[PDB]
Design a protein around this ligand. Structure first.
Ligand code: NA
Ligand code: NA
Ligand code: NA
Lengths: 329, 333
């Protein structure tokens, strides 16, 4: 095990946002991760009517960011090299609207100042979560605003919370797809802080450090999860078309306090994002919209090629794997 | 054959401390601009809406079939949402990053039109790009969901409102010194050659100036003390010669689309996009600077085949480059 969480087949023709007086709910998930990271707040809100949600990482001072987008199905807004917030949401491309709610709320907080240096920058990424439920409800401006309003320092709701409400893994065949969640992990090493946040909605499965498939591609007929490569290789061996459902992505953030140059931060982002092919397999496929944000608060100076980015990247890769395993738990 | 008005239209300094959207009962206005371009391209509609209280607006290109797209983004200040390789609409808007919300209004309206079908193949894909237009007016009003929805609702086949209309309402050029910045507009141009159709749409909000085919600066960097415009390079070279810091204001971009009916592979379409986008350094100078958020969408409706390197993309790119220069001059007229 763990116990199966099959998504089950969606019921088509379900209601959308116009059918409801949508009430934002503060997401608490299955448990709260507590950590110490001054200047970073996290909020998560959902609509039970979906169920679908949004998770917002708010860094009020603004933070330098690198964006690494992979796959054929990325859903991204802004992708800025400097952000006051990162907004992760369900609802496919429709859920990018949640980031507009964050942006608008930040503008209002700044008393509608619009000097170029005062622009409030929100980058948003989405997962397609419509197959995992029987409604067309999407995260909207009101839900992004709610997630920001619910944001507090040093807390993250694990599991079915915010953007993770209806995330799912293992999409060779929808009959074997399982609900994941969102996950976070945190490490402090001296003054160095690393926070990983992930919403895995992959076509692939979640894999632990022993190589065990722990979430996704669960066959009710056998009681066992299978690495998708075994399904693909048997399709090719039998000379029949392989199958896989569209509507997949993993959207993620690494937040650190270590000062990194733009080149270091971008190389760091690419290394950490590639590392996730250990815990999610396959990963970075044409079916996926994989988007990682690497964010630094530029607080700590560590003592032409960067050993510091490489070493920090290796550690952050482990924090991110732990976050993926929390999402699949 | 575009007769650009020599008369200055300096933006002037803003009055700031201006209020935001909810301070107003905002009614979308259908933008008519100074003149309507009429063109024959079935399957392509354009809508333009503005708020007088900005003034600011959005321009939406609606292609209900969906169309293969290449995005070419240059500079350090791009404001882009979606950037999809297949789009049902392109939304160009003011309001800097806040104006990307207009595209959410278009997306939501299209989802409602599809009766909330959400199959992956049924997703309604809208790519949005923005200009910073807050220095050209006082209010913090931005294109919002309602304005994007209005622009989509106002979309008319085969028409485009030239000038101060939609996203072009508060576009401006020539930002070495804001005292010399002039209002531009939005512009479009269209050519048919045999069965080939090319539509260019542009919203030039550049740090640079608009330049005609004779090399004359026709919009931006107008010095009211001398009654003439000149190329920004004169300002930059004088700064370096005097050993003082150069100056240039932030908040600049040119956002554009080239729509054609010629079938092109993804590789051809991306190469075509890069060629046409680079070509715009002829009509906008400087261009593709770190101060700019330049974003071009190259869209094909994949209707006609022309009879490893693409002569067709190169030839079509050369002609589209001229259509785009005409569109830039319509914006500056
Ligand atoms: Na200001
Ligand atoms: Na459907
Ligand atoms: Na077509």
């Amino acid at each position: 095990d763990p116990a199966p969480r099959l998504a089950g087949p969606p019921v088509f023709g379900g209601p959308g946002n116009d059918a409801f007086d949508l009430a934002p709910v503060r997401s608490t998930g299955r448990e709260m991760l507590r950590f110490d990271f001054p200047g970073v707040s996290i909020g998560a809100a959902h609509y039970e009517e979906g169920p679908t949600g949004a998770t917002v990482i708010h860094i009020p001072a603004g933070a330098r960011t690198a964006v690494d987008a992979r796959g054929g199905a990325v859903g991204l807004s802004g992708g800025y090299d400097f952000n006051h917030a990162i907004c992760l949401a369900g609802g496919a491309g429709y859920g990018l609207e949640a980031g507009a709610g964050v942006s608008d709320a930040l503008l209002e907080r700044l008393e509608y100042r619009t000097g170029f240096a005062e622009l409030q920058l929100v980058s948003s990424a989405v997962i397609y979560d419509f197959s995992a439920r029987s409604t067309a409800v999407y995260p909207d401006k009101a839900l992004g605003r709610a997630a920001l309003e619910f944001a507090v320092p040093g807390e993250f709701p694990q599991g079915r919370a915010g953007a993770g409400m209806s995330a799912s893994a293992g999409k060779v065949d929808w009959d074997r797809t399982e609900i994941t969640g969102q996950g976070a992990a945190f490490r402090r090493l001296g003054d160095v802080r690393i926070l990983a946040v992930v919403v895995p909605n992959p076509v692939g499965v979640i894999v632990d450090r022993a190589g065990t498939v722990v979430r996704g591609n669960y066959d009710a007929q056998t009681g066992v999860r299978r690495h998708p490569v075994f399904d693909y290789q048997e399709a090719f061996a039998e000379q029949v078309p392989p199958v896989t459902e569209a509507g997949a992505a993993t959207i993620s953030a690494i937040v650190t306090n270590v000062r990194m140059s733009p080149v270091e931060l971008n190389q760091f982002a690419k290394q950490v994002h590639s590392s996730m092919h250990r815990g999610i397999q396959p990963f970075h496929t044409d079916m996926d919209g994989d988007t990682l944000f690497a964010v630094t608060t530029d607080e700590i100076d560590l003592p032409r090629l960067s050993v510091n980015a490489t070493a920090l990247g290796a550690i952050a890769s482990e924090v991110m794997w732990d976050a993926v395993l929390e999402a699949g738990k």
